[PDB]
Amino acid sequence: MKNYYSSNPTFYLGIDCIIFGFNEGEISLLLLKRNFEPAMGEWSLMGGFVQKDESVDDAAKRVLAELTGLENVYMEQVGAFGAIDRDPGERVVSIAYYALININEYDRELVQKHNAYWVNINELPALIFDHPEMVDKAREMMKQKASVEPIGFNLLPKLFTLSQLQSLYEAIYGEPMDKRNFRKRVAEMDFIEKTDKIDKRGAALYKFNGKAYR
Amino acid sequence: NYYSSNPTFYLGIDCIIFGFNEGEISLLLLKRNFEPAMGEWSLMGGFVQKDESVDDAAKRVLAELTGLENVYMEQVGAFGAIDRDPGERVVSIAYYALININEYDRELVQKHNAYWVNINELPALIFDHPEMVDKAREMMKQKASVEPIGFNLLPKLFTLSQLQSLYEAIYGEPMDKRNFRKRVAEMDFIEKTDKIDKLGSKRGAALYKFNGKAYRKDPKFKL
Ligand SMILES: O[C@@H]1[C@@H](O)[C@@H](O)CO[C@H]1O
Ligand SMILES: O[C@@H]1[C@@H](O)[C@@H](O)CO[C@H]1O
């Protein structure tokens, strides 16, 4: 059995989940009031710790489910945050994970039962520790992702107008966009495709495809 | 004692140092100096210590195992599969860089028994090191697409062929010369100087430089 590596120290390994939600033209962040010390009661990302019996990726899934009830949310790793004094309680290196989801009814009731709250990304309260830095990094990742592949397949209807698409991009990027230049930029995205169908007024309908994955 | 209902983990460090030299990319490798898997081909592997940030751990590990200092690395990810390290549960945070080989002390590296291996002729690496390398390589490609790159990998006055060679090595593919120079035209961070190449491979070729102001990374990503 003994002890490979026992000369080295061990560390608490944190998990923080960053859940962006799109609804009615706005992005919100899912937040809670932290249920343990230090900084108990203060505004927080969904925070937990990696356990011995699980991968770090599965820790994220578990932490999310424990603190919000949400299951079946695919998340992408944001990074390992390991500044010495990031957590005032102990040395904690935290691994952040993020997703962008479409905010829907059953999920809404579930989240509310956990005392998690959707807060508009332009009106965030002061978050504990380095959570604002984590959120900023996830938001930049989301921006970059949206420029190279479909940002999600159930954020918008299967067939969507350019106006609907523009509202999603403006929310992600956090600034209004020029309609003509946005249309030109979309024409350069081979993963968005104009169909023959029209909205029912007369606006052209577009769809995401799988061309960014080839 | 906060958080004591939770366990603690060994936190690995792995450094993935790609080197650019004579139009090709290499990986800096070593023979692992501790067990298990002692003597086998490995990345610069260590562990985070109590004294240091994880970023600073990656610096110390790099300097201990190669002598290289002042090398900026970007985080690849935390690799946390339960069985990735057969010795023990270790969550390893991999870091990467693409450096200019000639710009560093090649004898200092040699002294540390670290070897540049060509990126297309890698030996079998230990544990999940090939996965880490693959991930770093994909990030290098993604950056090269969306950002200005290679200020310290090219001479201050460089040709379009030299710039092309960098991109070709990064993506690992020959490129169309026609379309590349068209893409180079849309890059506002590369400016054409008055000067010309009197020593290199295409004599009299236009020498370009990076415009520092335009090279600078945007604080927020632009569509
Ligand atoms: O980021 C914190 C981490 O440092 C630990 O306190 C667990 O909760 C997370 O939200
Ligand atoms: O990836 C390994 C890590 O798991 C630990 O063994 C330290 O060295 C690294 O190379």
Numbering used by the authors:
A (entry chain A): 1 to 200, 205 to 218
B (entry chain B): 3 to 225
Provide the authors' own sentences about this structure as they appear in the paper.
In this study we identified and characterized a novel L-arabinose-responsive transcription factor found in the Bacteroides species, which belongs to the NrtR family of Nudix-related transcriptional regulators. The NrtR family transcription factors are characterized by an N-terminal Nudix hydrolase-like effector-binding domain and a C-terminal DNA-binding domain. In this work, genome-scale regulon inference using the comparative genomics approach revealed that the NrtR family AraR regulators in Bacteroides and Prevotella spp. control not only the L-arabinose catabolic operons, but also several other gene loci involved in the utilization of arabinose-containing polysaccharides.
The movement of several secondary structure elements upon effector binding leads to domain rotation and causes major changes in the dimer conformation.
